[PDB]
């Protein structure tokens with residue numbers, strides 16, 4: 001279902017990539033996006049899929065565009081257009097300098113000092129979930145660990161009841177990987193209708209949870225509005241529920257297939273932080289973008305005002321111009337170059353939380369269950385969208401080779 005080619009786009013720049021269903025998905029989602037980096041494809045192309053939009057395919061262009069918010073605005077950062085237009089999360093729907101005072105409040109609530117404060121709980125929950133699974137000799141990693149570990153920590157941080165998880169998980173899925181049951185607008189409104197009473201309750205009687213802090217914070221000398229707090233909390237929910245969850249499945253699926261990579265981390269745990277970076281590169285999973293604020297010529301290509309451009313955070317680290325043998329996982333890379341948490345002013349606010357969750361998962365899983373694999377015959381399906389993911393991940397192991405700590 002292609003949209004008619006706009007008159008300003010030359011035919012040689014056409015490449016009909018569908019970000020929500022790439023043709024190569026059976027081979028792995030990162031591999032499916034990497035077709036955009038074969039020699040037949042220009043640096044910057046127009047797809048007629050999903051309403052019609054640009055895609056930058058090279059790390060250099062993606063970084064440049066994310067830096068230049070003057071031409072590439074966050075006002076409409078999602079494809080398709082209806083989703084980008086409905087999208088009003090704070091601070092991600094704002095350009096500098098407006099984004100600034102909000103970014104600082106996001107940092108207050110999900111930044112380093114909060115992570116450092118919650119580290120014990122993070123550690124506690126990983127060990128608990130893992131020990132609980134360990135003697136089973138099998139699990140569905142997506143539902144058995146990948147979801148509850150990051151999500152319960154986020155609900156803990158936000159002071160929200162775990163009973164609300166399935167509902168919230170549904171709405172977030174719809175926003176990043178639309179199935180078609182509901183528009184982005186409807187999904188957002190459902191999410192906001194959940195947030196609205198909570199925020200109100202918390203402006204009246206402040207707590208110490210992230211939502212209380214946001215809803216009672218200050219921006220530009222004045223109190224945050226109930227509407228702004230809602231737009232900010234909505235983003236935090238999305239980030240909390242649908243990023244690390246999906247990334248953990250990619251990493252664990254990989255580790256299920258490489259005993260030598262496992263042993264590398266088991267023998268020298270100080271390598272785990274670098275390994276985290278490398279897995280973040282190889283299994284990068286986000287792709288949003290920007291909208292053109294005016295007519296602009298960018299690397300020889302005529303862009304028109306209102307044109308959307310997808311700037312896949314996923315592609316920069318897979319670009320062979322940034323990393324040699326990009327599809328190989330090499331914990332010893334002298335520089336892991338990537339933009340997995342993004343680039344420019346909107347560089348992920350929760351990246352420290354995410355790394356902590358990944359680093360804890362790697363160490364605690366490999367300690368107790370050093371030897372595991374994918375269930376025999378099992379076929380792993382990836383899904384693609386604004387955030388790519390794993391449908392299911394059946395793992396198996398012999399409990400005789402596992403360890404309680």
Ligand code: HEM
Nearest residue numbers: 091092103236239240243244286341342346348349350354
């Ligand atoms: C592996 C995990 C994660 C990845 C790959 C990721 C990716 C990203 C990316 C690419 C952006 C920039 C989007 C843009 O430029 O439009 C972003 C922004 C953001 N993320 Fe993350 N994220 C992760 C985890 C989290 C978590 C756990 C949170 C917790 C709340 C979070 C909260 C945020 C927030 C608040 C922003 C907005 C920053 C701003 O606009 O100033 N992220 N993330």
Ligand SMILES: CC1(C)[C@@H]2CC[C@@]1(C)C(=O)C2
Nearest residue numbers: 092176238239286288386
């Ligand atoms: C693109 C993102 C990963 C980033 C954090 C959540 C997300 C879906 C957003 O809307 C901003």
Ligand SMILES: [K+]
Nearest residue numbers: 036041042057
């Ligand atoms: K290309």
Ligand SMILES: [K+]
Nearest residue numbers: 075084085087
């Ligand atoms: K918008």
